[PDB]
């Protein structure tokens, strides 16, 4: 309308958007600062950056932008391009990339009292310090630190935004159910907002928005933990294979290689920080070492099973432990020509008897291998079972605190 043109011309006749509106020298401009989250897009743990789609709700008062509505056809407010008015340089200080400012410069809403509200949109990428200790059963504490890049506390005073009814402050991120998409990998547990100062810097003030998000680990469970549980089952089973099968090495080594491959391909999805080892990596390394000891003890059992009196003499302690004491506990207890012909028969018989004695001793060696293998089966079942249970119980007992502390 023409009246809007006249009002804009009178408003910005001598208005300088370079100059912070301070009616008297020394005045501070109060800046409501609030955040509306429309989408928590990504929490890229490899580069420790959270990507969010937010509306930054800002409100301040520019005394220069005042008019009487009755003198201008009752125009109570205007939508003005944001570049034409002074704005506080509110930026995301902890942005991971170099993008400090908003993306969308929407029009500011200027009311006749000078109350300027501004709700620009931005796809922000903030640096979030990832605690890997319990990944993927982890809850991250990602913050979006907002403050004026230019003005300090002596120039602007940051405050919390107001709710729809301008009655009480909203000390949290606003989530509009109508416009908000759940991540599907993260559930927002706490979303408080708080002003922070620095005791070593009286000129510093910011508004920090905290996002206490808990990972939903179904993906990692299904794709890393269950396969590794199956591989650990196989590693246990290797101690039930008879050494005569000639396949204990195949089974144990395949389990070791499978667990190692799982660790290698999981290394791509875990952060590269070195402040702690994630519960998943600790579990995978546990299973790797257990399977390596499975390979070692399968080699030992194969060695025992293939000894013979022609190569080894059985020591007394192995006989004592693995023949009597252990098996009960494991329930695994077990005419010249006629003279020449008679000499031939005698030789055949004594040769058969010698073979029988040799076979008895070789069977003692095989029984020792069997008993040791059963002992290892039980020990490894117990170790794998309770170690896995303990690790995953520890992971399960990891939830964000009821009070966000901020």
């Amino acid at each position: 309308s023409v009246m809007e043109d006249t009002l804009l011309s009178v408003l910005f006749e001598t208005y300088n958007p370079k100059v912070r509106p301070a009616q008297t020298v020394g005045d501070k401009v109060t800046v409501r600062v609030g955040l509306t989250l429309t989408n928590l897009l990504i929490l890229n743990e490899k580069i420790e950056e959270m990507t969010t789609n937010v509306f930054l709700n800002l409100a301040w008062t520019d005394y220069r932008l005042q008019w009487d509505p009755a003198a201008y056809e009752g125009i109570k407010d205007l939508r003005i391009p944001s570049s034409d008015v002074w704005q506080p340089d509110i930026v995301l200080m902890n942005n991971n990339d170099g993008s400090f400012e908003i993306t969308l410069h929407v029009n500011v809403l200027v009311q006749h009292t000078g109350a300027v509200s501004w709700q620009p949109s931005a796809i922000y990428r903030s640096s979030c310090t990832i605690k890997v200790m319990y990944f993927p059963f982890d809850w991250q504490n990602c913050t979006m630190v907002f403050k004026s890049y230019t003005y300090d506390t002596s120039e602007v005073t940051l405050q919390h935004a107001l709710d729809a009814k301008g009655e009480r402050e909203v000390k949290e991120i606003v989530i509009n159910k109508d416009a908000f998409t759940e991540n599907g990998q993260w559930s927002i547990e706490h979303k408080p907002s708080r002003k922070n100062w620095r005791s070593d810097d009286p000129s510093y003030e910011d508004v920090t928005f905290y996002l206490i998000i808990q990972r939903k680990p179904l993906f990692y469970i299904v794709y890393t933990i269950i396969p590794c549980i199956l591989i650990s089952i196989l590693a246990i089973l290797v101690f039930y294979l008879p050494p005569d099968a000639g396949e204990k090495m195949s089974l144990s080594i395949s389990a070791l290689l499978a667990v190692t491959v799982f660790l290698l391909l999981l290394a791509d999805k875990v952060p590269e920080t070195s402040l702690s080892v994630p519960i998943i990596i600790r579990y995978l390394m546990f299973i790797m070492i257990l399977v390596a000891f499975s390979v070692i003890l399968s080699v030992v059992v194969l060695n025992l099973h293939h000894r013979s009196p022609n190569t080894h003499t059985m020591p007394n302690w192995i006989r004592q432990i693995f023949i009597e004491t252990l098996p009960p506990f494991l329930w695994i207890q077990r005419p010249q020509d006629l003279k020449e012909a008679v000499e031939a028969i005698k030789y055949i018989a004594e040769q058969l008897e010698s073979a029988s004695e040799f076979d008895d001793l070789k069977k003692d060696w095989q029984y020792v291998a069997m008993v040791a293998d059963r002992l290892f089966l039980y020990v490894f079942f117990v170790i794998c079972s309770i170690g896995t249970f303990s690790i995953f119980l520890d992971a399960s007992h990891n939830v964000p605190p009821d009070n966000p502390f901020a």
Binding site: N16, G98, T150, Y151, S250, P271, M285, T313
Partner: protein, 388 residues
Amino acid sequence: SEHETRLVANLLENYNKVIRPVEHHTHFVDITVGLQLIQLISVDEVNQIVETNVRLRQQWIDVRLRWNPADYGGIKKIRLPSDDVWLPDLVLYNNADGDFAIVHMTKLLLDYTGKIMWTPPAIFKSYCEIIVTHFPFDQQNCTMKLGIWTYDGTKVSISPESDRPDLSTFMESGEWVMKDYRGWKHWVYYTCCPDTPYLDITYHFIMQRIPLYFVVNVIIPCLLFSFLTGLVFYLPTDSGEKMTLSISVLLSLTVFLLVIVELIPSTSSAVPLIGKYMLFTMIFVISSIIITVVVINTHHRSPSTHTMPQWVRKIFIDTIPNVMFFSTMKRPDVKSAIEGVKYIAEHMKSDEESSNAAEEWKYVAMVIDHILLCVFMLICIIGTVSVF
């Protein structure tokens, strides 16, 4: 503010930002340059680029921008867009993947005395000569060389605020430890311009890698497979599985080689000790495979075609077994029927002789194999004690 509106109108009414802020063209602009490290974003070892989030604090006097506070309501400081005043063309010489100069033209603080305080943000992606020789236990020393591009020392002089960069608001990396950091000013005399000095400040950061991540994720698995390398020697030949174990160890080690070669730059200026040790352990695994093949061949020697040499008999059966004290080794028609029994007896006798010879060959194979096992375990002991 009406006072500040008038002040900004007056300060820039006839102000030309193309001109240096000196009262005489012979004078030089004194800029106090101070680098503030906010975050060490990344150290791209393969590409040898270090991304840092910094604030480039710059201070200088612009006497053209002086006023008297009494005539403007006592205003002593204003924020003024950096695009309105003269700014130093301060360039990062060793830029590799980003911007050479400041691109975020943030507002600058101006005193009534003409003192400017401009602290624009930047993401310095500087070239970093990565020394991959103690990876992952390496410390990297790479710098950020800052200088005025088109002015020499006689026109624009840059000096550091302090002998070190500012790390007061530095966020801990989680991958790197900042051991040292210093800022050195240098006077250079290029060939272009052999008369006047060119100034630049080189901020270097001595960074120590935190090796836990790579230790756990790369070194521990390779150590496990290297240890299993020598376990083939305790595996009996009769199992028919020595090749399975040794070759699986080798396959795992080549997979880890594939993983490792993509973690470090392809530079040959220095041989990465991780790569050297991978090559050494792979030569060890290859030697283990060769020797286990020799042991398998010996174990299956046929006494029919092979007779044990006397030296083999004296070495592997007579002396070495007596050295290993911790090993449990040892050290009418009836004429036709009679002739048939005789043949059975004599053939079984010859079979017993052949079996004894074969058992001797197997004993030699076992002794060789046990010697190799002891050698490998001695290597393990000396290695593990050495690292301590």
